[PDB]
Design goal:
part of a larger assembly, 3 chains, A mainly alpha (37), B alpha+beta (277), C alpha+beta (327), B: 277 residues, alpha+beta, 9 helices, 30% helix, elongated, C: 327 residues, five-stranded antiparallel beta sheet, UL25 (chain A), Capsid triplex subunit 1 (chain C)
Chain lengths: 37, 277, 327
């Protein structure tokens, strides 16, 4: 409450509308070596 | 300073009755020199607790003269501590010499001066000796604490009173309070060896019923007990808190009564001199 | 008429030639008993001789002008610091102000609060000074301008308060009220976080005869962040034992184990339930202390006008007792 302290800024839209994180990169590292070979 | 309460026009009937209110006290809100009757006006009976709460936010003022037009008054305590004056005892009790007085809101209602012309009413509070105003405040607060010649409460502000009580009762528990609590049996065993000590511990003391039910081990030694001693500041906190406990719930004493010539005891509905403190 | 006080003293903190008359002065306790009472008063875990050192670092001198004290706090507008520094004649003054700041910050840390170290006198009006030795004279009751100063330019005076610290309440709380005769309160604001703490001063006027809830709401953030960080450095034990739950079901039990008085040493009374109320490290009252105030008198008006100042109006000196504000 007091102290002119900082606040945790929450997602503006409801919680349901910000995606679960992920990582999509179909570039596979191993088979790339096999094709370059 | 002397407040000038101005009056509107009145029917010749109720002015004569108002003239007999020469010693009752009112409750202004602002302390200007000029003021009008409509300002100081309390609604009809109800909420003894809320009214008692609304007596510490405003300050009092007794009146001395009622002309057909204006109304003299006296700001009770703002700068005076020896200003002698007179006020009529409007309480159900008597007030002997020397004992202080306190303002308490009325009881049961039905004690209200109603003015037809102004269409308003006034509720002059009664004056009780401190020693019984404390007990009445205690009774009203205890009854208010049960909804978690008697009017029922409202639960609107009764919670505020219970809060004010539980705050002071919680802040009494300290690390030396447990030490002092440890000797309850070691105190009972003293209360049965002497008469006076026995009389100091009442019958419904709610702690004699503890020294027979519960056993407690010796308390753990404090963090760095060798440097400071806890029981003493515990007791100092208790003294300071109990000195101003009733004030926090009821009302502070406003004047002590003293008479030089007249007989000491003054019956109700009789004007008696007083000095203010 | 009004009655006065004269106290010969050292030109350490209140310097009656540097300021003109009409400003409140305070009386400072003898520091020996403060240093002593610390030894038993500082809480567990903290230091128990740091006030000793803080005082020894500032070496009778008895009075202190509010104009000087307000500078050695958190809240202050730097104009008044500059005034006190460059307008006081005295040697080594800024250093002394720094040391005094450290003193007060030690005082709150050691739970001997400065409100128990500074009684308040009236507003000074006169003084005769030798070389570094003064005799100030202040009112004590009655209204200020019943006095008679030996200025001969303005015989009477007024009361001057640094406008940087004057916090009004009614217009602040928006009571919708109308300014008549208002009280005057000098209030202190403590804050307790170990090695990171300070003191805030204010001068409050209002019609409120009982501050209480008014400050409790005004200083809400201070009380909040003071109740939780205040018990720090105190070793609390592990999770409280279930035996700590004070049994209530057993009061109006018709059938229960019972024991009359006079057989309580070690008889066959082993059957009573055990209850160990164990309170070690929780928030005590001195832990939740955040403010303290004291009534000063009654006031008509406040006008602001010049360094910024605040001239009182018909101040009537009526000093009261101190008060705690913890709940």
């Amino acid at each position: 409450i007091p102290g002119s302290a900082r606040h945790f800024i929450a997602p503006p839209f409801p919680v349901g509308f910000w995606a679960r994180p992920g990582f999509g990169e179909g570039l596979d590292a191993r088979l790339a070596l096999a094709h370059a070979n | 300073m002397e407040v000038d309460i101005a009056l509107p026009t009145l029917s010749p009937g109720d002015l004569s009755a108002l003239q007999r209110c020469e010693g009752r006290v009112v409750f202004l809100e602002t302390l200007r020199r000029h003021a009008t009757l409509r300002e100081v006006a309390l609604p009809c009976g109800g909420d003894v607790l809320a009214a008692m709460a609304a007596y510490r936010r405003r300050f009092a003022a007794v009146i001395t003269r009622v002309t057909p037009h204006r109304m003299l008054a006296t700001p009770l305590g703002v700068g005076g501590r020896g200003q002698s004056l007179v006020l009529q005892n409007t309480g159900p009790f008597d007030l002997t010499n020397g004992d202080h007085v306190c303002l308490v809101p009325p009881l049961l209602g039905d004690e209200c001066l109603r003015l037809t012309s102004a269409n308003l009413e006034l509720r002059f509070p009664m004056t009780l000796p401190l020693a019984q105003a404390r007990e009445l405040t205690a009774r009203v607060v205890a009854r208010a604490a049960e909804t978690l010649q008697l009017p029922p409460p409202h639960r609107d502000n009764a919670e505020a009173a219970t809060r004010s009580l539980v705050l002071n009762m919680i802040f009494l528990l300290n690390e030396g309070a447990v030490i002092l609590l440890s000797l309850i049996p070691n105190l009972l065993t003293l209360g049965a060896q002497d008469g006076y000590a026995n009389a100091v511990i009442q019958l419904g003391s709610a702690t004699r019923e503890l020294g027979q039910l519960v056993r407690q081990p010796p308390p753990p030694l404090p963090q760095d007990h060798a440097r400071r001693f806890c029981v003493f500041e515990a007791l100092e906190a208790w003294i300071a808190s109990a000195s101003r406990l009733g004030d926090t719930l009821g009302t502070r004493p406003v004047a002590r009564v003293c008479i030089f010539d007249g007989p000491p005891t003054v019956p109700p509905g009789e004007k008696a001199a007083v000095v203010e403190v | 008429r009004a009655r006065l006080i004269r106290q010969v003293t050292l030109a350490d903190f209140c310097e009656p030639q540097a300021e003109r008359p009409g400003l409140v002065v305070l009386a400072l306790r003898h520091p020996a008993d403060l240093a002593g009472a610390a030894y038993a008063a500082t809480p567990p875990g903290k230091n128990h001789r740091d006030l000793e050192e803080a005082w020894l670092a500032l070496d009778r001198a008895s009075v202190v002008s509010l104009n000087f004290l307000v500078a050695a706090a958190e809240n202050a507008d730097d104009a008044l610091r500059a005034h006190v520094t460059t307008n006081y004649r005295d040697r080594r003054t800024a250093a002394r102000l720094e040391r005094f700041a450290t003193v007060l910050r030690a005082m709150i840390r050691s739970h001997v609060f400065p409100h128990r170290a500074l009684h308040v006198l009236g507003g000074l009006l006169g003084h005769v000074t030798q070389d570094r030795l003064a005799s100030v004279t202040c009112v004590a009751r009655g209204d200020q301008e019943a006095a008679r100063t030996n200025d001969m330019a303005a015989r009477r005076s007024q009361v001057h308060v640094p406008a940087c610290a004057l916090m009004d309440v009614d217009r602040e709380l928006r009571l919708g009220g109308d300014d008549g005769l208002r009280f005057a309160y000098l209030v202190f604001v403590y804050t307790q976080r170990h090695r990171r703490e300070a003191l805030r001063v204010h001068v409050a006027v209002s019609r409120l005869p009982e501050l209480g809830d008014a400050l409790s709401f005004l200083l809400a953030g201070t009380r909040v962040d003071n109740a939780i960080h205040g018990t720090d450095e105190a070793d609390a034990p592990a999770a409280p034992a279930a035996a700590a739950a004070f049994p209530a079901y057993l009061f109006n039990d018709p059938r229960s184990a019972r024991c009359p008085t006079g057989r309580l040493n070690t008889p066959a009374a082993e059957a009573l339930p055990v209850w160990a109320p164990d309170m070690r490290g929780r928030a005590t009252r001195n832990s939740c202390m955040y403010a303290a105030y004291v009534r000063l008198g009654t006031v008509e008006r406040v006008v602001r006008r010049a360094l910024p100042l605040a001239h009182m109006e018909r101040f009537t000196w009526d000093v009261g007792a101190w008060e705690e504000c913890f709940f």
